């Protein structure tokens, strides 16, 4: 009925996919009130928040 | 005759026509003016039944009015619909993309009951889309045609069934209303009578009788003759009307606590109260005609009756007992017989007036619901009709009928015949009719009551055989919707001239003669036995005194399109179907030559199609140009008819009109004054006359292929004009406004040659597939740039160019001149939609010559693509020097049973070269019944053979034997119709004579330029990553299950793997195979297709733990 | 007992448990398989699963509110029945009762309707796909050809063999790179037939 | 069994999913019936389209805008919450409703 | 209050807040009452002067008041096809821009490698062609042991050398 052209609300970037030199990260460890523990990788120049939504 | 500006077309007919053909658009125009209430319909119904002249709008307003609230404190009434004038004329509405309507005014009236007040006002009820002079609506600039619809009429339908095991005859009744609740009856394998009401289980009918209020004494008194009824009264196991009423309440309504008054009034409110049950006036008339309850009374109070229910049960039990007639107490007797639901006295025609009236009624119900809602909330003494009435659901109902429905279709205009036969069409499928998948093979057949009410030939040959028909030539439509047909009344063996219109029931009652039977010059028959048509569709031999009706003419059964095939009665029915379907796919050429042998139904089908300018009053032509004719009338005034010059049709052809009068002529009223697309001097002309040979030639015409000549490309014989259009629109997006200007981002200068100072192309500039039509550039903003493009921009100094180019480019394969640019704008106060600031349409027209791949056809269903266009020197030429123009194969004639083309070829040669029958020693005995002035004819004499009364084989043999020589003494075609062709390529004559003659072939709209597409890499889909489909896109081909089975049967595994992975779904694989092909490397191995991972995500989302293992 | 022993032996022989027939956590299909796509001009298009998920989430939040508020049994039981009907209509629409309709009174397309019939995944996309490098035309008779030959029109053959002709007319130095070669092919300059 | 879907297959086993499998597949709990903000067209927080649960919309470009390169990869934006990776992980990550 | 508030909060797919739902309903009632009296559809100017706002604001409200269509209706009336299979993915990999980008990177690597080592390292660190991280002028000067004015002079000379047509033609065709 038509030739309709639609796009989702985002843009695709295309750089190289390298995995040898990345920005450094350090892993925090949050524990809920369930007795279950989760690990999230933040950045080095980043303040660790006290409560994280797991 | 009877049309004043006519070409003299001599006829072979031997019968006198008592009745002329009716107006061919009276199926549409009379129905719509019935819906309006026009004074022409008023005087017609005045002279044919003036006891109740009511239009569709007055009927809807009376059956709605008056609306009352719950307490009965006040009431609202409508009356007197009235239309204003049309706000814009037809060509202006077609050009400005606005609908063609007229305002509607209704005199409302609000009455206070207890206090006593009347507040009469005048309410505007929206704009009503009116119908033009040719039966077409105009909706948003396009031209739409609402086709008719065959539905099964409401009534009572007795039918019988035979048991498989016991082999007893089981009878059954269904009474089916409109919008009501069904109720049935039965006689089972035992002696019980079911009453299965509103699709419920079963009860004995004596339960329903007691719930209606009949005692067992009353049941044995009324049904005293019926062993079945007294047996079921013995087996009813239920006494007490209240007990039986509670029983049917419990069987009908499950889960509700039964009260006495609600259980009592449930059945009454379900059936005998007009709000929830109304078989229409047609249904009430049908019930009264079947049972015999009333005869002289006019139809009113169209709800059911307990008398009707007990008469239905009486009819059923007498049909099961085995009676043949039955008298209802209080009415005349009727015969007792089962009903056929495919009889044409049981299928009514719900035409355009009734369809639009149904949509108005649906809108008025939703309006009156909110009227009786808001009547009670806001107080009394403050309300007025203009605050009570909300016309939004009514106007939305009309708009949602005219758009987005499957009965309001796009008008199919390639030519006048297609435009005419898109109306006069009875589509049996639609809302309220049967679907396509669930339609049985019983309803798709030709019932023997279609004789004169439908065409047995013309149906679509696809998966719609029998579900779409077309009206016959002489047929009409009843006030109710039954399809009448005219018959001559013969009184005591003398055929009179008075014409009686009989529907299918009366045609079954009487006995009808045949049209080509020997009248004895006053009305008497000649032979003492007459072939007739009896009641059940049987054909007998009845003596000439029981005959009491006769047909008006032969070709009463055929349609409009089937009436233009010469020698129809020699073709087979499948090939006649293909001919009648391909006659309305022809394209308008640039020259439009009239056929050398036709039938009589060409002038009338042209001046009634509407694409021919017809003079309204007589006068003398004052000035002719290519744009207008101004006739000077007999009393002072003058009238200038404009012309449509090179206007695009719906399907992309051309709609040129050119005058055929001189600047001093005298015209009469009704005379053709200007041709159309496919007409020539008044009459229809869909093709050209081409000299044919019926030999097989070197394999180029093998299995329906055709070889032309180059003369038809040199002299522009089969050349048409096609016009496209392209549309872009500049709206205001979020980041700014789009701009139509020639300042495009990064592009060469040379592609901006033909563009003007402000965007759009100049008129006359030739375009090509890839060129710029409208230069539009959208704002982009600031995004992330790659370092490589950043370095290139810093090298060459250009800026970021913050606006993105999305122009309008002409798509692939198109070319041709630019005809006109139609540009709308916001600043000129044009009614663009929300957001659009400027819309511009560009028309590109090209002139297509004939080429191999284009599809040609004749009239008798012999189509075929063009295989090779030879040069004009290597064609088989006659002994005189004339080359032939097409060469048709001879293996497709005998096994397809269409020798209408051979007889048309012979008569075409006779009508081309002329004849003179030597009446020196009297008229010879083949021509004893030829008319006068068919004994001689000049060359290029147009003749006409009508459909079932045409030129006989003996007359064709005689006319073939006596023609007249070309220029010298040379008769090129001997008595058999065959000529001694030479061979233009090797030189020697062909060893045996070959049939030649003139055949009328036409060019079909299945052209090779519109069908070819290809794709290497284009757009891809959204959810799954497969390519798109269709020539409107780039579009890929579909490689389905059967092709997968063929590849597996071959054993090609790698071909199948690369067809299903790196060509459809391997998203990381398509770019790798493209770069490997471009760099010249080897093709990589495929990966997992995308659709399988989509499948795994759906299966995991249905709470199933699908996990793929490893080893 | 045989017809019961079928499913009882099925639950007994494996390491399955029958407790998976009731649910405590519906899963949610990822948002690229039920997309919200903006058309040309601000019209949106959703995929009818967002309505079913929205009804489940709305009724579950309302039920959490009613339970933590404290409500009578009639209200809470009606809410639980509504939540159950919503999840049933999500997994299979039109199985128990009336189908949930959208606008214009058409039934919505639930999760199980992506899988069944001729329009499902298994028959519409897994077994028969659209393909690249393909095209159609209308056939005519070629009675001078040999048995292993077919005539191909040049306008279709150019579009089918476009990457091969781009590689070859870069390698023969008719163009400098892939972009200019593609521009030359789409404008159909007359070297491309001698390459083709 | 592995789920990276590289072409080393031997089986395809279907079972009956338990709740401790569902809340081990999922990447976070969707708990609002919101899809997209009506004015700015960005996916709402904890909705049906939330980038914190289903991954980011723009390739290697987080939501609030603090990290925008391929240099930052697999890091969690401590203000907004989205991890920075490709945008094709929005067809591969599921959520759950409690 | 609870029924109308929750109908505003839940009746729509893209959620519109309560105050904008209020002004949409007010605009609808105003437009209906004006359409009844006029006998015509009211213009945005008449609606704007009625509601005491601007016609741009009226257009924005009528823009926000639109409901999405569905991807699952069969836009082919034969039922064979649905609307979701007629939409071009306008943000996909175009399969010739990727190979063109790869060839551009190859050619840029070649032209950068046909220079002096210090100038090539300066250009790579200046435009971030090493690892996608552009470096600062003082950072390049620190890691190469010279001053920032020397670094920017070397950069200007190298940019002139690359801008010269002898090295620049094979990249000039790409843009
Ligand atoms: Zn962030």
From Swiss-Prot, chain A:
This is RNA polymerase-binding protein RbpA. Forms a complex with the RNAP catalytic core and with free principal sigma factors. Binds to RNA polymerase (RNAP), stimulating transcription from principal, but not alternative sigma factor promoters. It comes from the Bacteria. The chain holds residues 3 to 56 of 111 of the full protein. Belongs to the RNA polymerase-binding protein RbpA family. It comes from Mycobacterium tuberculosis (strain CDC 1551 / Oshkosh).
From Swiss-Prot, chain B:
The lineage of its organism: Bacteria, Bacillati, Actinomycetota, Actinomycetes, Mycobacteriales. One of its GO terms (biological process) is DNA-templated transcription. It is an enzyme of class 2 (transferase). One of its GO terms (molecular function) is ribonucleoside binding. It catalyses: RNA(n) + a ribonucleoside 5'-triphosphate = RNA(n+1) + diphosphate. This is DNA-directed RNA polymerase subunit beta. Pfam families: RNA_pol_Rpb2_1, RNA_pol_Rpb2_2, RNA_pol_Rpb2_3, RNA_pol_Rpb2_45, RNA_pol_Rpb2_6, RNA_pol_Rpb2_7. Its EC number is 2.7.7.6. It comes from the Bacteria. PANTHER family: DNA-DIRECTED RNA POLYMERASE I SUBUNIT 2.
């Amino acid at each position: 009925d038509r030739v309709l052209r639609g796009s989702r609300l985002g843009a695709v970037s295309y750089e190289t996919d390298r995995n040898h030199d990345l920005a450094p990260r350090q892993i925090a460890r949050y524990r809920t009130d369930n007795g279950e523990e989760f690990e999230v990788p933040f950045a080095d120049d980043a303040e660790i928040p006290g409560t994280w939504l797991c | 005759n009877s049309v004043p500006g006519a070409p003299n077309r001599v006829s072979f007919a031997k019968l006198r026509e008592p009745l002329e053909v009716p107006g061919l658009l009276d199926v549409q125009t009379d129905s719509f003016e019935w819906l309006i209430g026009s004074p022409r319909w008023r005087e017609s119904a005045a002279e044919r039944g003036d006891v109740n002249p009511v239009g569709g709008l007055e009927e809807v307003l009376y059956e709605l009015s008056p609306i009352e609230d719950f307490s009965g404190s006040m009431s609202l009434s409508f009356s007197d619909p009235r239309f204003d004038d049309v706000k814009a004329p037809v060509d202006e509405c077609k050009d400005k993309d606005m609908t063609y309507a007229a305002p509607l005014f209704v005199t409302a009236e609000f009455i206070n009951n207890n206090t006593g007040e009347i507040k009469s006002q005048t309410v505007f009820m929206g704009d009503f889309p009116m119908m033009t002079e040719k039966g077409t609506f105009i909706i948003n600039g396009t031209e739409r045609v609402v086709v008719s619809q065959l539905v099964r009429s409401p009534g009572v339908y007795f039918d019988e069934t035979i048991d498989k095991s016991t082999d007893k005859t089981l009878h059954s009744v269904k009474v089916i209303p409109s919008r009501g609740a069904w109720l049935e009856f039965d006689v089972d394998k035992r002696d019980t009578v079911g009453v299965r009401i509103d699709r419920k289980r079963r009860q004995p009918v004596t339960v329903l009788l007691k719930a209606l209020g009949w005692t067992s004494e009353q049941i044995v008194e009324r049904f005293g003759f019926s062993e079945i009824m007294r047996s079921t009264l013995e087996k009813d196991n239920t006494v007490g009307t209240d007990e039986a009423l509670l029983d049917i309440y419990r069987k009908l309504r499950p889960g509700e606590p039964p009260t006495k008054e609600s259980a009592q009034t449930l059945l009454e409110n379900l059936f005998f109260k007009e709000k929830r049950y109304d078989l229409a006036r047609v249904g009430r008339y049908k019930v009264n005609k079947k049972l015999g309850l009333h005869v002289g009374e006019p139809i009113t109070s169209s709800t059911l009756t307990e008398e009707d229910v007990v008469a239905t049960i009486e009819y059923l039990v007498r049909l099961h007992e085995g009676q043949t007639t039955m008298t209802v107490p209080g009415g005349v007797e009727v015969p007792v017989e089962t009903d056929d639901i495919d009889h044409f006295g049981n299928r009514r025609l719900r035409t355009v007036g009734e369809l639009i009236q149904n949509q108005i009624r649906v809108g008025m119900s939703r309006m009156e619901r909110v009227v009786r809602e808001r009547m009670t909330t806001q107080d009394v003494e403050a309300i007025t009709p203009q605050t009570l009435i909300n016309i939004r659901p009514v106007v939305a109902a009309i708009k949602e009928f005219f758009g987005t429905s499957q009965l309001s279709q796009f008008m199919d205009q390639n030519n006048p015949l297609s435009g005419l036969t898109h109306k006069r069409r009875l589509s049996a499928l639609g809302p309220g009719g049967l679907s396509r998948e669930r339609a049985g093979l019983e309803v798709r057949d030709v019932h023997p009551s279609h004789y004169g009410r439908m065409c047995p030939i013309e149906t679509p040959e696809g998966p719609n055989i029998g579900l779409i028909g077309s009206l016959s030539v002489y047929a009409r439509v009843n006030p109710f919707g039954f399809i009448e047909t005219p018959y001559r009344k013969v009184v005591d063996g003398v055929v009179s001239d008075e014409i009686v219109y009989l529907t299918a029931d009366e045609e079954d009652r009487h006995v009808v003669a045949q049209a080509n039977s020997p009248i004895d010059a006053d009305g008497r028959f000649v032979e003492p036995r007459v072939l007739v048509r009896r009641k059940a569709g049987e054909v007998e031999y009845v003596p000439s005194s029981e005959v009491d009706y006769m047909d008006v003419s032969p070709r009463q059964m055929v349609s409009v399109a089937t009436a233009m095939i010469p020698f129809l009665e020699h073709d087979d029915a499948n090939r006649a179907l293909m001919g009648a379907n391909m006659q309305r796919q022809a394209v308008p050429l640039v020259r439009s030559e009239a056929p050398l042998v036709g039938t009589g139904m060409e002038l009338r089908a042209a001046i009634d199609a509407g694409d021919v300018v017809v003079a309204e009053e007589s006068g003398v032509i004052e000035e002719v140009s290519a744009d207008y004719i101004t006739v000077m009338h007999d009393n002072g005034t003058r009238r200038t008819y404009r012309m449509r010059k090179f206007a695009r049709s719906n399907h992309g052809t051309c709609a040129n009109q050119c005058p055929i009068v001189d600047a001093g002529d005298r015209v009469e009223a009704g005379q053709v004054i200007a041709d159309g697309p496919c007409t020539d001097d008044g009459e229809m002309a869909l093709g050209k006359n081409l000299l044919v040979a019926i030999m097989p030639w070197e394999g180029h015409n093998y299995e329906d292929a055709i070889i032309l000549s180059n003369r038809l490309v040199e002299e522009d014989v089969l050349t048409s004009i096609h016009i496209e259009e392209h549309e872009i629109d500049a709206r205001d997006t979020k980041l700014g406004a789009e701009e139509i200007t020639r300042d495009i981002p990064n592009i060469s200068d040379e592609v901006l040659a033909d563009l003007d100072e402000r965007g759009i192309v100049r008129i006359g500039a030739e375009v090509r597939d890839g060129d710029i039509l409208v230069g539009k550039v959208t704002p982009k903003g600031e995004t992330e740039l790659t370092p490589e493009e950043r370095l290139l921009r810093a090298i060459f100094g250009e800026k970021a160019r913050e606006v993105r180019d999305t122009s309008l480019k002409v798509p692939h394969g198109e070319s041709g001149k630019v005809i006109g640019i139609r540009v709308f704008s916001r600043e000129d106060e044009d009614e663009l939609p929300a957001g659009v600031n400027e819309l511009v349409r560009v028309y590109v027209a090209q002139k297509r010559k004939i080429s191999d791949g284009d599809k040609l056809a004749g009239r008798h269903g012999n189509k075929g693509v063009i295989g090779k266009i030879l040069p004009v020197e290597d064609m088989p030429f006659l002994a005189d020097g004339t080359p032939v123009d097409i060469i048709l194969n001879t293996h497709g004639v005998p096994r397809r049973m269409n020798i209408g083309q051979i007889l048309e070829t012979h008569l075409g040669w006779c009508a081309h070269s002329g004849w003179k029958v030597d009446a020196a020693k009297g008229v010879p005995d083949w021509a004893a019944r030829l008319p006068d002035e068919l004994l001689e004819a000049q060359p290029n004499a147009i003749v006409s053979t009508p459909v079932f009364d045409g030129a006989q084989e003996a007359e064709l043999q005689g006319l073939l034997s006596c023609t007249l020589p070309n220029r010298d003494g040379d008769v090129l075609v001997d008595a058999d119709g065959k000529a001694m062709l030479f061979d233009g390529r090797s030189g020697e004559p062909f060893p045996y004579p070959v049939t030649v003659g003139y055949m009328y072939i036409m060019k079909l709209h299945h052209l090779v330029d519109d069908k070819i597409h290809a794709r290497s890499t284009g757009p891809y889909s959204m959810i799954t990553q497969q390519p798109l489909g269709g020539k409107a896109q780039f579009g890929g081909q579909r490689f389905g299950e059967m092709e997968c089975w063929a590849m597996q049967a071959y054993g090609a595994a790698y071909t199948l793997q690369e067809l299903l992975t790196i060509k459809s779904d391997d998203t990381v694989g398509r770019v790798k195979v493209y770069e490997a092909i471009v760099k010249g490397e080897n093709i990589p191995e495929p990966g997992i297709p995308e659709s399988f991972k989509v499948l795994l995500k759906e299966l995991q989302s249905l709470c199933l733990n699908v996990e793929v293992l490893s080893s | 007992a045989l017809k019961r022993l079928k499913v009882v032996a099925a639950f007994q022989q494996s390491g399955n448990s029958p407790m998976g027939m009731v649910l405590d956590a519906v899963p949610v299909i990822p948002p690229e398989l039920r997309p919200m796509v903006q058309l040309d001009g601000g019209r949106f298009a959703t995929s009818d699963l967002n309505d079913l998920y929205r009804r489940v989430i709305n009724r579950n939040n309302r039920l959490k509110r009613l339970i933590d508020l404290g409500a009578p049994e009639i209200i809470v039981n009606n809410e639980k029945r509504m939540l159950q009907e919503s999840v049933d209509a999500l997994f299979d629409n039109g199985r128990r009762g009336r189908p949930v309709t959208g606008p214009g009174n058409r039934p919505l397309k639930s999760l199980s309707d992506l899988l069944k019939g001729k329009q499902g995944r298994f028959r519409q996309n897994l077994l028969g796909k659209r393909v690249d490098y393909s095209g159609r035309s209308v056939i005519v008779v070629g009675p001078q050809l040999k048995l292993h030959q077919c005539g191909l029109p040049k306008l279709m053959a150019l579009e089918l063999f476009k990457p091969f002709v781009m590689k070859r007319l870069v390698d023969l130095n008719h163009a400098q790179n892939i972009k200019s070669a593609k521009r030359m092919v789409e404008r159909q300059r007359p070297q491309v037939w001698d390459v083709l | 069994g592995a789920m990276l879907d590289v072409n080393f297959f031997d089986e395809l086993r279907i079972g009956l999913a338990t709740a401790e499998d569902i809340r081990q597949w999922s990447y976070g709990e969707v708990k609002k019936p919101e899809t997209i903000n009506y004015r700015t067209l960005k996916p709402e927080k904890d909705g049906l389209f939330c980038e914190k649960i289903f991954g980011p919309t723009r390739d290697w470009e987080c939501y609030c805008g603090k990290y925008k390169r391929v240099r930052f990869k697999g890091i969690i934006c401590e203000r907004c919450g989205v991890e920075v990776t490709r945008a094709k992980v929005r067809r591969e990550r599921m959520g759950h409703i409690e | 209050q609870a029924i109308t508030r929750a109908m505003a909060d839940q009746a729509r797919t893209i959620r519109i807040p309560v105050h904008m739902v209020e002004v949409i309903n007010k605009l609808g009632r105003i437009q209906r009452e004006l359409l009844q009296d006029l006998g015509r559809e009211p213009t945005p100017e008449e609606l704007a002067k009625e509601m005491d706002i601007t016609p741009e604001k009226v257009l924005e409200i009528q823009q926000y008041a639109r409901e999405p269509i569905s991807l699952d209706q069969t836009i082919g009336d034969e039922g064979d096809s649905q609307l979701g299979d007629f939409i071009e993915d306008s943000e996909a990999v175009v399969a010739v821009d990727a190979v063109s980008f790869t060839l551009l990177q190859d050619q840029l690597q070649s032209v950068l490698d046909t220079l002096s080592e210090r100038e090539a390292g300066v250009v790579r660190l200046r435009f971030g062609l090493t690892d996608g991280q552009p470096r600062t002028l003082d950072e390049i000067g620190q890691v190469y042991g010279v001053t920032r004015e020397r670094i920017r002079q070397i950069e200007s000379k190298t940019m002139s050398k690359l801008r010269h047509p002898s090295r620049s033609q094979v990249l000039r065709d790409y843009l």
